[model samples]
Target chain A: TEAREELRANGYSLLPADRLVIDAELRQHVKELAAEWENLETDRGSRFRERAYDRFFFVPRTGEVRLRPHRPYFQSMNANDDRDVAPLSRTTLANPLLTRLLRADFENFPVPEESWLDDPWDVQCHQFRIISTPDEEGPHRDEVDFGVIHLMGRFNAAGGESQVYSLERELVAEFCLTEQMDTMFWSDGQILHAVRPIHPVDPTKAAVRDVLIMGYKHEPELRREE
Target chain B: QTEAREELRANGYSLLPADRLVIDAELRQHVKELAAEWENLETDRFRERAYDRFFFVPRTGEVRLRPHRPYFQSMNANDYAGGIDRDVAPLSRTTLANPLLTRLLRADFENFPVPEESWLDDPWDVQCHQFRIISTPDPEGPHRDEVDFGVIHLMGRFNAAGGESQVYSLERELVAEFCLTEQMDTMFWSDGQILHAVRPIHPVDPTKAAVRDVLIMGYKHEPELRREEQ
Candidate 1:
């Protein structure tokens, strides 16, 4: 329970590649996928205009993964606002290694029994981002039970580290990723987090940081009707 | 090819004999030499392990992927650990450099009929896990793999016996039982339709050494479902 307690106290826990049990081949596949991210449209789902990103969704019931079309993400500030958007395109599903890792991570996280008793969990969304310049989304808490961020790679970027803070604005932890595929899992409902602004190692050249943000949340509207 | 596909659909499995598959004698001899070199290698590779196995991800015209150590799960028998996660080693340059072996595999796959709805999106992503059995070479009883289809090739067998393969229907009825005697003997099947197993191998001549080598190549299905909006 040491790991669990650490996550609860610090708002996040870092896991290295060996600790996560991800093989190099699987990581290489992820890298290959990320290399093609530019081909995908910039996420209209994001509220911000400064970041470049793409979003994909996976529903367990259909066992299918899809790339989200350009649309505003659901914002808590405007709860009932409706926006018309094109539906997403279907992408190929994951390989065994990625599937197993996601399953294991979901099972490892502690969820409230009452909340999940109805099996209402509907979607797992992946937000793939490539931040090019110094920018911050500000401190925020997502409307979800858990959040996991996987680092793919960082090049010529400095000061783009992540920071997690408690409700009282007490600093919990602040650190930078040292290796590719390093990850952090956190209790999103219990704390707030943000990223520090980044700058290029050489100002004359362009730099970017690639990351995949995965969220596990319950969406009652999308629940199975059976 | 259509006939082979029909046989697979109707009976759950099909066999391709040596003469039809192993057309080149030189390539067959090279495989034999590879086995001999594997047997003599310091025994250090399989050291301190209960079972000896070599895992490979064979791709056409490229270096075959290799795992650092053997991996197993307790499917029908509980002799091995359930889940294993380990690093993979790269296959030797010599084995991958064999133009004949690669060409043979490419042709075999080309002639073999893949199901209309296959699990593996890329047909070339094949897993070849080979095992060298010395004494018992424990049989895994009878069970189906997670894959949609599988191809088991008998590479070489020396001084061994009683290793007949058995295929059973979903209803547990015996579908087929045959021993793979030649180097190029093969068993291709739709794994979802039937369960398969091999009897333990025993020394045919106890006076001398014995070894059994097999390559179990499988086309894996998509691990999960993914669909686009209608």
Candidate 2:
């Protein structure tokens, strides 16, 4: 594939799959994580907030911080992944599918260096936002080289299909609930699509459909262009 | 390897990855905390009151300082010239050298990952050194280097913006730039591979100032030492 050729040339690749995993382990992992934090503020303040939030701290001996979804900076996933992420996790944030999402999200796109991590587990929770509007996320692309979008729930949502379009706006591929069941589409480059906000059945459920977004880029230059 | 090493040596600088922006904040904070202890109030003689900064140096010529207070007295002077008893520029040796700075140097030198011959000094060991504080942002012109590695850390926030770090490579390429925001740091080639300088900050206020409190750490590796040992 063109992506395979690009990966060989530039040392990266993106393959979008409908169902990477469907077993109880992943479901439980998600359930466990969901139980830990009810909202973004809790995970951010209690888990990821620090003065020098941009740097890395040597994980302590107990590795207790590695357990929680928020503490270790990177999420700990059970084995079902291809990479040998230490602390014995499958995906960066306990979701093996998230890795695929990042690649598929930014297919053939130049990802921001900050988003890239030498060790996937070195990933952290920097920014989190929930999209509920059919509002087009705009025509702009991200500056990060790595990113992952988490789908917390699938309400009665249709037509919010992830449309993968090229730089020249050429149609690449379309991924719906069928392309990968119980999976959220992630792409750094190849796709520039946004969900057509769900028609919430109730006012209370407007904020209930949660989506976790993470982006990675190498540290930006200290002084921006004058 | 020889060609790359020669390129680095000829250019006077090289990019060492691990020493990126991530390593700056803590080290900068540590230097600032240490400088506070030996601030102007503590030492009148070493203090440059009109300048609003203090220049500290070693006793005399570069003396191999062990872990101690006198190590800082040396820092509270010009370049290194060692002699404690003689009529030397006096500062309070009691409330001198920040122990934390001293310990940091000791620890930093241990796992220093840069190649041995990466730096060129007469003896090749510019491991750890301290700076008191620079009141004036504009000190010397064309601030080039003659050592292996050098670092500057600051604490208090300043009105200054363009006091950002700049570098020019051997081919006269403006390669690296960094600002002092969110405690930013950029480490480029040390010797001449690049030229280093900072834009001046002129708020014209003394107390509400940005103290150039930096820990100037350099490195050296003598091939002769290895030969002699062998």
Candidate 3:
């Protein structure tokens, strides 16, 4: 209840690794996924700035999680810029480990208390790569109820400090995703957030700021059924 | 895998030459017998087709049976085969364990640009059609599949002719035009970057069986990572 109170009051709740409970198998898969963090390139142009993976899941309040069929992750065509707006595939495949993450999400969030248990919840997962370049990223908010972020790892890199701001544009908190399993749970409609640019700790060494973020919303009425 | 991967990466598609697509002698003979078993399929309401379809997970040696989900294609992906949730039969156990198919599937599966373990996570659809004179008519036209990568292999060809395969650039220019005339003639391709079509075929002599057996396997990955070589 304290966690729910915090999410309601501040629009976000921070959970360090100690607060989150991860099972052995799920933890192992996450560790393997992090160790082999190869991902798809985010852009098709000549330059390669980032790599990403997008997958979606369904969380049932009464049962285990399931992966939604692979559909193109679509957003309003009215985006910040003329993004090609297509869902790309993971160069690495999506394992059910992601579905497991959503089950963890449903339990850790205020979904049950908020009365979201009556219908299935849709959750979107995004795997982010560290940006070697600075200033290309910006603060943004998801158009959803509750979303989560988990830091898988950050190696030979730094500067992924994040900030959450209220809908009124007031700063809510300044934090960094510094440890593995460090997480942030927030309602996107209630706040805006962003992560700072990340760069290699040493130019010669490999740089990785592997992060997994998810956001979920109620099923849209217009979505076609299976 | 080397040559096929190289050719596709360079030209959006690659033809695995017939002689190069080696199958053991035993399975080569079984090819016709196995293909001969295709039951009639109403590919759509008024359209009749002959084929068997199933879900094939590459890299998972799981076994003799699989119940298949209906196959559908986006309109942008296929005109004829597009927009229909086609009910198709499961592949037979004989078909699944065929030494020839096993080799081809393994080769194609291992050739993906990603790690094999990672590649296995994507959904793969497998369908093999027994195209006689009647079945080849209006077989879908020039378009890329809704998948990122795939392969097409000729398992057997009897009295059939004119089923020439054509590969094209995303700009619609015809790049390669040929036929998988030999028993093992195959082509591996980047399905997202290129479009392809199989021209209709008929019996060279209408008296004989106009059989043309082929195998198609593709991963239904989102096409946005439309790399020229994926």
Candidate 4:
């Protein structure tokens, strides 16, 4: 409720560092998980390159979790097409640290409480991603109710600035995320956002930008259709 | 020549292998060299999609090729500079004067399949663009290009996968699908009749970087003159 008012007023909201930072142990586990992307197959040759491998899906209703094959992580579902996504990972679904982060987002953001299932109190859906690109998707808006982008690492890069723009294309704010645990939460349906090209200082070297992109949606519930 | 023309007339598109498209090894090497410097070229000014460097040739009685600023289609909204801006730079002499490119283009034009009565009677006017695609998805799905005819030559594919060319009918029926992996492997299509798209290319070996290079040259017909009502 409070988060919704602030988002309506200022287009974005940043969680307090104390509240958002994961515990040291969980952060280590996520970092290890994120690094596995190097060996994971990427869907680069597709028509649209999200170039990510998704891991799991979590639902609040039945406290059910499911694992899935790796696929490109779309920020939001396409309006015209069916978005087939897998259920939660048993590991992440039961992880306390991950649940805390999700719970914090649901409480602080405008996501309706009833939209979530009872018990462990899961939102709609969540996924992990490792985005590899020199330039990010240009200024664009998503069709999701709310989403969070958790920065896992900033490896071998210079200008991966996170940028937010007004609907009128005016610059709202921008920052070069250098911290390991830095994260951003926003109302995807409200504002336009994009990331500046993450240029590697040495073009000859390999570089990547990793993050966990999680969100809550209403129409496309996390439950698998029988 | 008759066979090539008939093929284009029947299918509205054709893919030429390296030997069929560019015979000279020296010219093939030269084109590869020019394309190798793709990333170093200036990035596209627009955030529309894809990163590319473009060049154009004007029809001044005869084609006088110049830099970035040449006349092309500014009428279609499908293109960024449609009726609003005409900006581009001239091609470098090394590239413009490359014997292989010049001769090949002229040869294709000389044997162009369409009869003169059907299309504009123009030669020399050209829009050449060199594209470098990394991890981006295809911007246009199965869509028609906004030109009369065009040639897409795959310069190189380095440590990358995908980037296959798919052609379809106006009714969305599949026509052809193939990857242009060899240098000088080219796809020529009648933009008005055929729709085409390229699959996204990603790095096969993430330990090293990857990129897909392509040279797309489109020929635009002169604007149709308006006539007064009788």
True contacts kept of each: 0.00, 0.00, 0.00, 0.00
The residue-by-residue lDDT of candidate 3 on B1-230, one tens digit each, is: 67556656666775555554354677667665455444343343022334443344555642222233245533344543321244444555565566655555556755555424554644454444433334332267689767667787676666775566766668875444556766656677888778998766666555554666666766443212221211
The TM-score ranking, best first, is: 3, 1, 4, 2
Q: What is the TM-score of each candidate against the true structure?
A: 0.42, 0.34, 0.43, 0.41
Task: Residues B1-230, candidate 4: write the lDDT tens digits.
Answer: 56545656776775566644464677657776666655454454111112212222222223444323233544344565422244444444555556555554545543346555444344334566667666632256888757667787777778876565666678875445556777777767788888888655655655565677777776665444222222
Superposition error at B100 for model 3 (Å):
54
Superior by lDDT: candidate 1 or candidate 3: 3
Worst 10 residues of 3 chain B by lDDT: B221-230
TM-score-best of 1 and 4:
1
Off by over 4 Å in 4: A1-226, B19-25, B37-39, B45-62, B66-90, B117-124, B136-139, B223-230
Point to the candidate with the largest lDDT: 3
i-RMS of candidate 2: 16.1
Assign candidate 3 its CAPRI class: incorrect
Displacement of residue B119 (Cα, Å) in model 4 is 6.1
Tens digits of per-residue lDDT, candidate 2, A66-174, equal: 1222233433211000122222122333342333233334444343343332223232333222333332233224443444445554443444454455666655555
Residues B153-191, model 2: lDDT tens digits: 443334532244455555544443334433322233445
Q: Give the Å error, residue A32, model 3.
A: 1.8
Give each model's whole-structure lDDT: 0.53, 0.36, 0.57, 0.54
- Tell me the lDDT of model 4 at A219: 42
Model 4 chain B: weakest 10-residue lDDT segment is: B45-54
Runs of candidate 3 with Cα error greater than 4 angstroms are A21-24, A44-49, A52-59, A64-66, A69-94, A112-115, A133-138, A220-225, B1-230
lDDT of 3 at A53: 40
Please give the lDDT score for candidate 3: 0.57
Report the lDDT tens digits of candidate 4 across residue range A165-213: 8888878898766666576778877787887755556656545665556
